[model samples]
Target: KVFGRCELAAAMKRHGLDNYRGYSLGNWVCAAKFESNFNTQATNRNTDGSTDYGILQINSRWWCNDGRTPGSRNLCNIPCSALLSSDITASVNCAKKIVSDGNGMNAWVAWRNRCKGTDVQAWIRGCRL
Candidate 1:
């Protein structure tokens, strides 16, 4: 089976990012660590403890009736999933947006650093591979 949040996050990293500068695996793991706790099955909740669906913690109802639809494209009309649908382009992109949008691409680059076939911790709080 395809699993949930952290798996979703890792899948997103593999499909979305095209390259990394330095310490790519460290950065990817960093993004996952900071963003979703590397729990592909994770569901972040509001202060009220309501459901925030999917990895990257996107709200399904807020974006689309289905979690996968809005995932196919980003708020920018960018079909990020078109870049890679089996992964989490939308989720990763969304987190990147929340972190600083254009400036947040660096975070993504960092994420890439951690996942490039190397076991390196980009940040103190990281996931176990």
Candidate 2:
């Protein structure tokens, strides 16, 4: 379990996700915090029979294939379990790819609902990017 907002931000920054495609580090961090509370093992089963994977909570119906689901777009070409790692390389890369596809942070419902237009600076609190 990688703990703390600073730790997660540092990892995201190192992955070049602090700012990408016009989204801010605050948005990413804030979304991560709300989506999974920085827990890489976090998973949520949506009512639609699709599961959200990992810290970014990338969806099985679109971003990945959890094996239990059929006909997933699997845009990232990696298993959803790969996202549940102490290391976030796959999750971060997948997130970037999703944003690059023009979804931006809108792919993350948590970001749109909670982090958007809010004071997200607290997400990066003591972290120096």
Candidate 3:
């Protein structure tokens, strides 16, 4: 499912994304906005055979086990397929773990490209926290 902007903002808010790991919820929203256009079924295969899954585009190589990425860490101990579900819990949980690992949001290349050092608050304008 594709999420409307405010819908996406509220969803992430419910997931405790507000200032999560020092990144604003709007930053998270903007990252996902650019990463997948808020599309739950979004996916991308990386050059090294790793695939990014779901809206947050959680990577199979380090975060989830897809059994295809060489030297995969599966640090979140979840299936890559879990991130693809519309439930979004796996994606949120895994994203939390990724940043909590101390790498921060820079782990998401899309965030680095789109949200980092930008005014992301606009992404969540008028959305209830």
Clash statistics: count for each candidate: 23, 0, 0
Model 3 RMSD, rounded to 1 decimal? 1.0
Per-residue lDDT tens digits of candidate 2, residues 5-75? Answer: 88888888889986689787888999999899999999999888889989899999888889877667898
What's the alpha carbon RMSD for model 1?
8.6
* Model 3: per-residue Cα lDDT over 1-129, one tens digit each: 888999888888888877998888888999999889999999899998999999899888888998889899899999888888878878898889988887798888989988888999999888776
Model 2, global lDDT = 0.88
Off by over 4 Å in 3: none
lDDT of each residue in 86-107, candidate 1, tens digit only: 3455555554444454444343
Backbone steric clashes in candidate 3, count: 0
| lDDT of every predicted structure (CA atoms) | 0.42, 0.88, 0.88
User: What C-alpha lDDT does candidate 3 achieve relative to the native structure?
Assistant: 0.88
TM-score of 3: 0.95
List candidate 2 stretches off by more than 4 Å. none
Candidate 3's displacement at residue 33, Å, is 0.6
lDDT, model 2, position 121:
78
All candidates: CA RMSD in angstroms? Answer: 8.6, 1.1, 1.0
